[PDB]
Symmetry: C2
Subunit: 169 residues, 2 copies
């Protein structure tokens, strides 16, 4: 019901209708589109359900993900289809955020060219710290889903298992 | 017996005796120290066993690791104790290399300052693409281990499960 936030960074929602677009305000109402947010019980994170009934106000849904700390040493994204990974922090404290989106239409975009979703998506100006922008073409009587979560990086090998493993091979 | 290579990058071994140090040559023999390499049967990678018998030629073992492609967009390190992770490639094709070393004495050093292991380790010159360098103080009748391996990125959530999981919460 109430907007939930990712384990890190800023997840922003926008809508377009033809050549018109704008970023949605925190509790902004959209004609034909409803937003339900549910917290993840196991790991840190959430699922968002975009319930599309009508395309009267919006033809497309837009989203943008950015780790808005210009002081951080590391901030990189890995995109695999409709999913992405964000590595943020420093070498001595590297954190991982994982996310799953409705479409594979994800672009490394310039966060300073974000006046509207359509300007961010078609942004191409040179940037050392890009943000991610996504395009979700909408359909009536359909549901779209998002998932932002953290993964416990279970290392397959520890130093104390290595001497036995070396002798075993 | 024969030197093995990591799934990516270059793993270099060096030794020191007092204020004197040098990087070991591919089949360079060291008095009191033997190097046995074994391939990992499950995943892509290897284990190295540094068998120390005597400290007559060397009191300290040194090592370096770097991804030597300046053309490459991304190369970042995450160090957690005596273990590290390397994220290399581009956003659209990011790869992960994992490693286990004998000590937690790991530094983001400057590759250009690598004439000797002691110069690399104490390098303070600022660089955008550092190399990892570690110090392993040696002891007679002891064994040190290294492990370079790749981890199969099993994503905890997929878009197919999201509608059921949302309804389940």
């Amino acid at each position: 019901a109430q907007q939930l936030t990712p384990p890190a960074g800023t997840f922003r929602l926008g809508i377009s209708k033809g050549t018109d677009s704008h970023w949605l305000a925190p509790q902004e109402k959209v004609k034909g589109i409803a937003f339900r947010w549910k917290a993840l019980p196991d790991t840190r994170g959430f699922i968002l359900e975009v319930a599309v009934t009508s395309l009267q106000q919006a033809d497309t849904l837009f989203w943008s993900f950015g780790n808005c700390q210009p002081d951080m040493d590391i901030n990189v994204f890995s995109v695999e289809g409709q999913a992405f990974t964000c590595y943020y922090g420093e070498s001595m404290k590297l954190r991982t955020l994982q996310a799953v989106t409705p479409t594979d239409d994800i672009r490394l975009s310039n966060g300073r060219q974000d006046k509207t979703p359509l300007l961010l998506y078609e942004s191409g100006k040179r940037t050392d710290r890009p943000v991610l922008a996504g395009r979700c073409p909408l359909a009536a009587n359909s549901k779209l889903y998002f998932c932002f979560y953290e993964q416990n990086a279970r290392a397959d090998y520890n130093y104390f298992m290595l001497p036995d493993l070396f002798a075993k091979i």
